[PDB]
Amino acid sequence: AIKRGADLIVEALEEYGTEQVVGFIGHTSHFVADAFSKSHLGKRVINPATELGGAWMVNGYNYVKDRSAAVGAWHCVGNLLLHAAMQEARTGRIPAVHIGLNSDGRLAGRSEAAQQVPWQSFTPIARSTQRVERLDKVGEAIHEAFRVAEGHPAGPAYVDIPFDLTADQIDDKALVPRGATRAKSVLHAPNEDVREAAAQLVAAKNPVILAGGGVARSGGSEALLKLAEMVGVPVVTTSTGAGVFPETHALAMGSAGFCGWKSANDMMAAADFVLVLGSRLSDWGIAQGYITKMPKFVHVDTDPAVLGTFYFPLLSVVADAKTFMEQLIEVLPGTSGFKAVRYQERENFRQATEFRAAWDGWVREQESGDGMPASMFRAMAEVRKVQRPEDIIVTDIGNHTLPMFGGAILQRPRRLVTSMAEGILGCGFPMALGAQLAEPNSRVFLGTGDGALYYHFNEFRVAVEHKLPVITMVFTNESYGANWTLMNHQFGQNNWTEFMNPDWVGIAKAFGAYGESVRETGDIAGALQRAIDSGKPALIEIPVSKTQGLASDPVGGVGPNLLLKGREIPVDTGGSMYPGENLLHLK
């Protein structure tokens, strides 16, 4: 049957499981928009204020879904705004398919052409970059994009299609690949490796299980709870893993790292052995700038590239995290040295509970006071009083990241959202809107700095039109507070850190969102109640200090090395000159 390339694009997207389209209009996307209007995808298309805001929504949506359920579809030069969000998806393991409609292929390669997008700029970023030359390759290329995006490692795939192909027509027989079943990802470990890991766990004086975001992707929460209680071993997470183990449990230390919980950092410093499940041991994660000293450890991942790249394990194992834990549960009764007793009765339990109690005491101290400015730990204590197990916490990047991570106490996977891998400022608001689109009946709370909110608050258009009831706290300090604080330490003076805020309540009201400031009241509790009652996107202005959080608060970190010390470098005396030095030799 004769079909337009635009219709075939829509058909392929539907075949591979697309639920949500984020699209931007222009003459190159006209046929695609027309085709979507005839599909069940048409109704709920999001047309964002900008393409980078929309690309952040795709990342929030897909981070919580663990598949490319949201897709981008972009008119030519709007694809030039994608790179920042695309880079986060790469290193942050977010599946995400982007379809770029380029200008007419007849005009490609002409030196004075307009809007001929340099798709080769994505080659260093996307996990897959494809330029489609021929109409009969459109289905094929979209099939490949999903294959790469939803693999191990997950990441972004970009497909560039000159838009004349979207207008052209062809017979459709077999053109969209249909009917594939993917390989299972329940990879089992060798029995000997399971037994060696069991033997280490039972021999250790102060063991730890370290669960990263792979445990969430694997669906391993039930197995982790059973394992940790059976061996009686404290659980530490990464920031992407937080919530895979209930953080109200006596064994829960929280997340290790420089914006994490001191209980977790104390536990990692005390440990003699670690079982690492589904973590890449990253720079701004466990490695803390490659300064952290790992105890002896077993490392279990589905991606061999992460195993042994920097930290050399005692044993590296290619396996699924859930599956590995189930294998371990089966072998432990027959492991020499294993004793089946309640976790509360183990010798290692007191030290772990002490670390947690000391952390919890510090956090309670940070929640105290009723000043202006307010404490961001106090703001999070108020969120917790109105927070359900399914609800999602979002943050942006800055001093505020630390109190958001420290005040988040989670019970389910994928409830903590940000630009985890890259720390790209401005992510938080649009990622929160994407997460809300993915889970319409979950409540989404965002804690954002003022410098951060400046980026994409234009997306209040989408929030108000689509009635996305995200509750946003904007922490105001008239500064890039992390940099204010760090530069004062480093040089004795800050520069480039200060700015004027708008009347944020006035901004919210100008869009038709709920707005309220607690500057004169301190009534964070009441503001959250009123925001929730509104049924609208909401903005609550909360004044904070320039110093609280990332750049100041003692959580047991060792890195990263942000305030590096320069070295004196020798000149080159081999005889070659600098450019222009010729003039200095003239007599």
Ligand X SMILES: Cc1cc2nc3c(=O)[nH]c(=O)nc-3n(C[C@H](O)[C@H](O)[C@H](O)COP(=O)(O)OP(=O)(O)OC[C@H]3O[C@@H](n4cnc5c(N)ncnc54)[C@H](O)[C@@H]3O)c2cc1C
Which residues of the chain form contacts with Mg ion (CB under 5 A)?
A: 449-451, 477, 479, 481
Residue 576 has a CB neighbour count (10 Å cut-off) of: 7
Kindly tell me which residue out of 289, 313, 423, 526 binds ligand TPP, with binding defined by CB under 6 A. Answer: 423
Q: How far is the CB of 29 from ligand TPP (least distance, A)?
A: 8
Distance, CA of 288 to CA of 282 (rounded, Å)? 8
CB of 59 to ligand O=C1CCCCC1=O, least distance (A): 17
Applying the rule CB under 6 A, the residues between 113 and 142 that interact with ligand TPP are none
Which among 37-45, 211-219, 522-530, 579-587 is the span making contact with ligand X, rule CB under 6 A? 211-219
Q: Does 375 sit near ligand TPP (CB under 6 A)?
A: no
Radius of gyration of the chain (CA): 26
Alpha-carbon distances, residue 433 vs 402, 425, 463, 510 (angstroms): 22, 16, 7, 19
Q: How far is the CB of 397 from Mg ion (least distance, A)?
A: 11
Between the CA of residue 234 and those of 61, 237, 325, what are the distances in Å? 31, 10, 15
Amino acid of residue 65: K
Tell me if 396 contacts ligand TPP by CB under 6 A: yes
Question: Of 203, 222, 250, 305, which one interacts with a copy of itself (CB under 8 A)?
Answer: 305
DSSP for 288-304, written as a single string: TTTT--PPSEEEEES-G
User: What is the spatial distance between Cα 246 and Cα 243, in angstroms, rounded to a whole number?
Assistant: 6
CB of 115 to ligand X, least distance (A): 8
Task: Choose the one of a copy of itself, ligand O=C1CCCCC1=O, Mg ion, none that binds residue 554, judging by a C-beta under 5 to 8 angstroms depending on kind.
Answer: none
Instruction: Give the one residue of 267, 397, 432, 527 binding ligand O=C1CCCCC1=O; rule: CB under 6 A.
Output: 397
Task: State the pairing for strand pair 235-237/169-171.
Answer: unpaired
Residues 162-201 binding ligand X (CB under 6 A) are 185
- Three-state DSSP state, 539: strand
| DSSP assignment letter at 498 | B
Q: Which is closer to ligand TPP, CB of 162 or CB of 207?
A: 162
The tokens of 536 are what? 């609208």
Number of C-beta neighbours around residue 579 at 10 A: 5
Please, which residues have CB within 8 angstroms of residue 289's CB and are 6 or more apart in sequence? Answer: 283, 559, 560, 561
Q: Which stretch binds ligand X (CB under 6 A): 79-87, 118-126, 136-144, 237-245?
A: 237-245
Site string for a copy of itself, 155-184 (x = CB under 8 A): -------xxx-xxxxxx-xxx-xxxxxxxx
Sequence-distant (6+) residues with CB within 8 A of 439 are 64, 390, 392
* Residue 396 interacts with, from ligand X, Mg ion, ligand TPP, none (CB under 5-8 Å by kind): ligand TPP
The string of DSSP letters for 375-407 reads PHHHHHHHHHHT--TT-EEEE-SSTTHHHHHHH
Count of residues in contact with a copy of itself, rule CB under 8 A: 182
Between residue 7 and residue 66, which ones bind ligand TPP under the rule CB under 6 A? 24-26, 51
Any idea what the Cα angle at residue 99 is, between residues 65 and 459, rounded to 5°? Answer: 65
Q: Determine, following the binding rule CB under 8 A, whether residue 487 of this chain makes contact with a copy of itself.
A: yes
- The residue range among 6-14, 145-153, 476-484, 565-573 that interacts with ligand TPP, by the rule CB under 6 A, is 476-484
Per rule CB under 8 A, is residue 111 in the interface with a copy of itself?
Answer: yes
Kindly tell me which of 141 and 452 has the beta carbon lying closer to ligand O=C1CCCCC1=O: 452
Q: Is residue 480 within the footprint of ligand TPP (CB under 6 A)?
A: yes
Burial 57-96 (b: 16+ CB within 10 A, else e): bbbbbbbbbbbbbbbbbbbbbbbebbbbbbbbbbbbbbbb
Q: What is the footprint of ligand X within residues 403-422 (CB under 6 A)?
A: 419-421
Report in angstroms the alpha-carbon separations of 416 from 213, 303, 393, 408: 11, 23, 5, 8
**Binds 152: which of ligand O=C1CCCCC1=O, ligand TPP, ligand X, none (CB < 5-8 Å by kind):** ligand X
Closest CA relative to residue 254, chosen from 272, 241, 271: 241
- Which one among 68, 239, 292, 436 touches ligand X, defined by CB under 6 A? 239
| Torsion over CA: 137, 143, 144, 145 (sign) | positive
**Beta carbon of residue 467, minimum distance to ligand TPP (angstroms, whole number):** 23
Work out the number of other CB atoms within 10 angstroms of the CB of residue 126.
Answer: 27
By beta carbon distance, the residue nearest ligand TPP is 449
Verify binding: residue 450, ligand TPP, rule CB under 6 A. Answer: yes
Helix (H) or strand (E) holding 200: helix 191-203
Residues that bind ligand O=C1CCCCC1=O (CB under 6 A): 26-27, 75, 397, 423, 482-483, 562
Residues that bind ligand X (CB under 6 A): 92-93, 114, 152-153, 185, 212-214, 217-218, 238-241, 255-260, 278-280, 282, 284-286, 301-303, 306, 320-321, 397, 401, 419-421, 423
Residues that bind ligand TPP (CB under 6 A): 24-26, 51, 75, 77-78, 396-400, 423-425, 449-452, 475, 477, 479-483, 549
